[PDB]
Design an enzyme around this catalytic site. Structure first.
Site, PDB file in Angstrom:
ATOM      1  N   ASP A 160       0.840  -1.187   0.000  1.00 50.56           N
ATOM      2  CA  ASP A 160       0.000   0.000   0.000  1.00 50.56           C
ATOM      3  C   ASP A 160       0.878   1.240   0.000  1.00 50.56           C
ATOM      4  OD1 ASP A 160      -1.983   2.062   0.778  1.00 50.56           O
ATOM      5  OD2 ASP A 160      -3.248   0.290   1.093  1.00 50.56           O
ATOM      6  N   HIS A 186      -0.831   4.878   0.284  1.00 49.67           N
ATOM      7  CA  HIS A 186      -1.491   6.060   0.836  1.00 49.67           C
ATOM      8  C   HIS A 186      -1.295   6.150   2.346  1.00 49.67           C
ATOM      9  CE1 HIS A 186      -4.188   9.433   0.106  1.00 49.67           C
ATOM     10  NE2 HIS A 186      -4.728   9.171   1.283  1.00 49.67           N
ATOM     11  N   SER A 241      -4.776  -4.875   1.215  1.00 45.28           N
ATOM     12  CA  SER A 241      -4.073  -4.580   2.456  1.00 45.28           C
ATOM     13  C   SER A 241      -4.612  -5.415   3.614  1.00 45.28           C
ATOM     14  CB  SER A 241      -4.195  -3.093   2.791  1.00 45.28           C
ATOM     15  OG  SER A 241      -3.622  -2.305   1.765  1.00 45.28           O
TER      16      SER A 241
END
Ligand code: B12
Ligand SMILES: Nc1ncnc2c1ncn2[C@@H]1O[C@H](CSCC[C@H](N)C(=O)O)[C@@H](O)[C@H]1O
Length: 576
Positions: free
Chosen positions: A107, A109, A160
């Site tokens: 991931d 962000h 995730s």
């Protein structure tokens, strides 16, 4: 004079922290360290008294998140100047607890994480940020390396959740005892209870936002509440684990075959899909000046915990003032970023002849439609339906066996490849405010690029709506023809299909934007998706699918039934 400059030293600190005054924090804390017998008394003393003021001030509704991070900028800058004196004189200063925070492997962000982290530091809790795309290995290794009382995991996309459950199973295999806090946009209370908890003997707590987090780390890290809180979390996580567990998801699944026979009903012989004015792949780029007008500020306010829709939020009797100042700052930065061209939004768009075949979309090399250069797969809702059809995005493209000439579009845009550099710079000078600002702004810029480009496609590139002219408000309401679904969202959950877009558009080679193993995009401030012209095309969720589609899809994707089940985990109508 100044009035507050005539107050007690540790009083000017409290004032500068709350009000966020930076100019005097340097030549004001050096005086407070003298009065103290040791470097840690200033941090543990006045420095925190003010933050305690920010805390209750905030809890009363006389202060908000944007202002709070500004207080952190004064604190974190007071410590920065006062760190050479502390270490060079030992003592690690009393803290409320340590925590390892990181964005799950794959991931990218981290805005939400940066917020949770800064807020916790404003409560004296120590935070070690490993960053993003962090391997579960370094996570558990860092927590051990620097004795952490808690481990915090962040995750934006579905893939995730897999790496999260992984961390919990590893914390068990290694004997960890400390609490596990899982948060993110992809994390829910039901998943944490049904898929994360049971894999760890220690406490596992899901927490919506960064405010109720400090409240959890507080009771979960205390002595007079710690035990009662875990037991309560367990019980609840059960009345929900057994709630979803059984009492079966009432909404009987359906044969992938029956679903397919209920595909979108349309008389294609009577309809003629607009012909794209242009075909091919085009490297695109728009300035910040052009994209500002396409920016949807509402999500931006949400990101800073300011409730309300834009522009009405600017007049709210409670947060209007602060929303205005936050808005002014954002625009101030855009002006600079634009004038200096330090941040440059860029992307790529493409239109191709296409036709439906089953639940997928064949993409041809040219208009002869003799050579297939790629396939867009897509999934079909597998739930009994009356009055409605079992939707599949493919359904909105003319069937191959109809002879009708149709098309399909693709795009990938980013707010700027400089997002990270810029974030680091502010990160350097301990400026959490615009470190968050620049990323939130890069995100707005990206989504603004997607709105602008979808308009260009509709009016020019594809050209079926050249006379169309909507207001930004009108665009946000999607009062236009066609849709632009993005891999990962409800109508097209399979994140792997982003590879299809990256192949068709040759995204990386054209823009720099990248793709991870979990199929997250980089920079973080980036968007990508498809373009459909059909006036009847709309968003929906594929939801839970069965074994039959998992297998058929597996064949089509050339993956094991095992691999496709991991990728469609959240959408599986059966157990793992
Ligand atoms: C606009 C928005 C974006 C933004 C910007 C803001 C942001 N992400 O914060 C951008 C444009 C980058 C984006 C894009 C994408 N997105 Co998006 N996005 C949205 C949307 C509408 C709002 C989220 C928001 O503004 N969050 C506010 C921020 C500040 O909050 P947050 O990240 O959740 O963090 C808070 C808490 O959760 C918490 N928390 C966070 N981490 C941690 C960690 C710990 C340890 C703890 C204790 C607590 C905690 O603290 C925070 C502050 O309160 C949502 C829907 C929704 N409402 O969730 C989807 C959503 C997150 N997006 C989704 C997807 C699919 C994508 C894209 C792949 C789409 C594409 N283009 O193909 C990309 C990702 C890009 C990449 N680089 O990989 C999904 C699904 C996840 C999935 N299946 O993968 C969502 C849920 C949409 C949906 N309805 O399906 N996103
Ligand atoms: N059910 C669905 N299936 C596929 N994509 C979807 C979807 N729902 C939403 N999306 C994607 O997400 C977009 C809405 S979010 C982006 C616009 C929003 N005003 C913002 O600024 O954040 C849709 O236009 C589409 O790009």
């Amino acid at each position: 004079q100044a009035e507050w400059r005539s107050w007690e030293v540790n009083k000017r600190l409290e004032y500068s922290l709350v009000k966020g005054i930076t100019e005097f924090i340097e030549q004001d804390t050096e005086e407070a360290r003298q009065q103290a017998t040791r470097p840690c008394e200033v941090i543990e003393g006045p420095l925190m008294d003010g933050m305690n003021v920010v805390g209750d001030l905030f809890g009363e509704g006389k202060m908000f998140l944007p202002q709070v991070v500004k207080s952190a900028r004064v604190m974190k800058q007071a410590v920065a100047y006062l760190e050479p004196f502390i270490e060079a004189s030992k003592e690690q200063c009393k803290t409320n607890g340590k925590m390892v925070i990181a964005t799950v492997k794959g991931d990218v962000h981290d805005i939400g994480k940066n917020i949770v982290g800064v807020v916790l530091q404003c409560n004296n809790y120590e935070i070690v940020d490993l960053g993003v795309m962090v391997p579960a290995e370094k996570i558990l290794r860092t927590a051990k390396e620097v004795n952490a009382d808690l481990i915090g995991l962040s995750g934006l996309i579905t893939p995730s959740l897999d790496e999260m459950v992984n961390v919990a199973k590893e914390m068990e295999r290694q004997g960890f005892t400390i609490p596990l806090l899982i948060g993110g946009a992809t994390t829910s209370k039901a998943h944490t209870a049904v898929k994360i908890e049971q894999n760890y003997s220690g406490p596992t707590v899901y927490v919506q936002n960064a405010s109720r987090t400090v409240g959890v780390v507080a009771a979960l890290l205390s002595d007079t509440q710690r035990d009662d809180f875990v037991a309560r979390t367990r019980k609840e996580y059960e009345t929900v684990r057994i709630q979803h567990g059984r009492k079966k998801p009432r909404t009987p699944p359906v044969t992938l075959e029956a679903a397919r026979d209920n595909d979108f009903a349309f008389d294609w012989q009577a309809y003629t899909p607009p012909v794209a004015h242009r075909l091919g792949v085009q490297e695109v780029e728009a300035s910040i000046e052009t994209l500002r007008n396409y920016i949807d500020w509402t999500p931006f306010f949400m990101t800073w915990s300011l409730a309300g829709k834009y522009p009405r939020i600017l007049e709210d009797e409670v947060v209007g003032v602060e929303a205005q100042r936050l808005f002014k700052d954002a625009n101030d930065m855009l002006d600079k970023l634009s004038a200096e061209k330090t941040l440059n939004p860029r992307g790529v768009v493409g239109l191709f002849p296409a036709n439906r075949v089953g639940d997928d979309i064949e993409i041809y090399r040219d208009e002869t439609r003799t050579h297939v250069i790629n396939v867009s797969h897509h999934l079909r809702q597998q739930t009994e339906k009356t009055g409605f059809a079992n939707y599949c995005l493919a359904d909105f493209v003319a069937p191959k066996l109809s002879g009708k000439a149709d098309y399909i579009g693709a795009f990938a845009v980013t707010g700027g490849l400089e997002e990270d550099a810029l974030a680091d710079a502010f990160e350097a000078q301990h400026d959490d405010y615009n470190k968050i600002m620049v990323k939130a702004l890069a995100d707005r810029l990206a989504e603004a690029f997607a709105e602008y480009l979808h308009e260009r496609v509709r009016k020019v590139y594809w050209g079926y709506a050249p006379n169309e002219n909507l207001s930004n408000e009108e665009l946000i309401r999607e009062n236009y023809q066609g849709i632009r679904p993005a891999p990962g969202y409800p109508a097209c959950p399979e994140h792997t299909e982003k590879a299809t877009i990256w192949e068709l558009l040759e995204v990386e080679k054209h823009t720099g934007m990248k793709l991870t193993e979990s199929f997250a995009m980089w920079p973080g401030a980036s968007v990508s998706g498809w373009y459909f012209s059909h006036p009847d095309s709309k968003y929906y969720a594929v939801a839970q699918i069965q074994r039959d589609q998992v297998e058929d899809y597996a064949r089509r994707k050339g993956m094991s039934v095992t691999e496709v089940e991991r990728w469609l985990a959240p959408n599986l109508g059966y157990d793992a």
